[PDB]
């Protein structure tokens, strides 16, 4: 499913992401925008043989199991295909674990390069939240 901007912001807020570990909702919407263009079905393969999955492009080496990444840790304890559902609950629960592990949102390269230090509140402007 390809979310709308305000639609996605509302689903993320409902799932407890607004100000989670200090990160306002605009940050999470901005990161979803540049990681996946709001598409829950997005997948991207990396040179190390790992693959990123879903609206927040979560990586198979550490966080989920896709059956084809050697040395994978499956820290969110889910199949990576669960991260592609139109229901974003699995992605949000896993992202909560990722953002909590010490490096905050710098774990997402697109966020670091395209959202960090910008006016991220523009991503929720105009939405009925």
Q: Which residues are annotated as a binding site for substrate?
A: 101
Sole binder of Cl ion in the list 46, 49, 121, 122 (CB under 5 A): 121
Measured distance CA(93)–CA(23) in Å, rounded: 15
Identified binder of Cl ion from the candidate list 8, 26, 31, 111, rule CB under 5 A: 26
Catalytic residue among 7, 18, 48, 52: 52
Secondary structure of residue 10 in the 3-state scheme: helix
Q: Which is nearer to Cl ion, 25 or 94 (CB)?
A: 25
Residues between 43 and 102 that touch Cl ion (CB under 5 A): none
Is 59 buried (19+), middle (13-18) or exposed (0-12) by CB count in 10 A? buried
Sites of contact with Cl ion (CB under 5 A): 24-26, 109-110, 113, 121
């Amino acid at each position: 499913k390809v979310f709308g901007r305000c639609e996605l912001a509302a689903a993320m807020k409902r799932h407890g992401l607004d100000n989670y570990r200090g990160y306002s909702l605009g940050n999470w919407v901005c990161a979803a925008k540049f990681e996946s263009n709001f598409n829950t079905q997005a997948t991207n393969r990396n040179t190390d043989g790992s693959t990123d999955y879903g609206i927040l492009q979560i990586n198979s080496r550490w966080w989920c199991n896709d059956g084809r990444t050697p040395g994978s840790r499956n820290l969110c304890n889910i199949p990576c295909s669960a991260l592609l559902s139109s229901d974003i609950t699995a992605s949000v629960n896993c992202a909560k674990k990722i953002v909590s592990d010490g490096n905050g949102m710098n774990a997402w390269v697109a966020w670091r390069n395209r959202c960090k230090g910008t006016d991220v509140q523009a991503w929720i402007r105009g939405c009925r939240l």
